[PDB]
């Protein structure tokens, strides 16, 4: 019945895991520059809905940003945050998770 | 080469097998044990338990003492949770820093 630091870390790693498709989207954008949902979908042979779904996650995690295009067509494209930014955000997220887990394992009072 | 791909690889290396969690739990709950005892209780291969304990030892999550009453063997025990978290934090920070340097 005892709480388990390894088990808690497993849950944290799952929460911060990446789908393979997230890696493909991020890597495509870093290489090619900002792209529309439709362009990403065609390039990677994924559905537009699935791409939108993963973009929401990557935006909230701070790994991708959006920016307006006004070039006849008007809409948003999506751009990779730079590696230094991605790694800064990931570091903050995992440290946050560890800090929460630490509260379960304090000694004394 | 991209930071998410490198994080995936690093996070795989820092991952735990479900058995690791069970091995740690057993040692924390019941105290220091021999490999054969852990394997019996968990219904795992003794070789497998042995190899996972070697991984956990290198990571700083278990310790061992040599004992020789008859045949030589190791008694493994759980490191305390705060040491586990401290070591894990150090390790994952080290990995992120290494990946940071790949790009700088
Ligand atoms: Cl996927
Ligand atoms: Cl679009
Ligand atoms: Cl042994």
Question: Using what technique was this structure determined?
Answer: X-ray
Torsion of CA B50, B53, B54, B56, to 10 degrees: 160
Number of domains present in the structure of chain B: 1
B14 and A13 in contact by Cβ < 8 A? yes
Query: The domain that contains B100 carries what CATH number?
Result: 1.10.10.10
Instruction: Choose among B82, B84, B89: nearest Cβ to A6.
Output: B84
Instruction: Find the B74 Cα to ligand 3 centroid distance in Å.
Output: 4
List CB contacts (< 8 A) between B8 and chain A. 18, 23
- Residue B24 structural domain: 1-104
B2 and A10 in contact by Cβ < 8 A? no
Pull the structure tokens for residue A100: 């929460």
Going from the C-alpha of B44 to that of each of A4, A7, A89, B49, B65, the distances in angstroms are: 19, 18, 39, 7, 22
Resolution in A: 1.5
Closest CA to A11 of A94, A92, A89: A94
List CB contacts (< 8 A) between A10 and chain B. 15-16, 18, 21
């Amino acid at each position: 019945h005892m709480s388990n630091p390894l088990g808690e870390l497993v849950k944290a790693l799952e929460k911060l895991s990446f789908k393979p498709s997230d890696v493909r989207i991020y890597s495509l954008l870093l290489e090619r520059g900002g792209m529309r949902v439709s362009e990403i979908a065609r390039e990677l042979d994924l559905s537009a809905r699935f791409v939108r779904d993963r973009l929401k996650v990557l935006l909230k995690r701070g790994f991708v940003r959006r920016e307006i295009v006004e070039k006849g067509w008007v809409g948003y494209i999506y751009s990779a945050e730079k590696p230094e930014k991605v790694l800064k955000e990931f570091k903050s997220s995992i440290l946050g998770e560890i800090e929460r887990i630490e509260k379960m394992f304090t000694d004394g009072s």
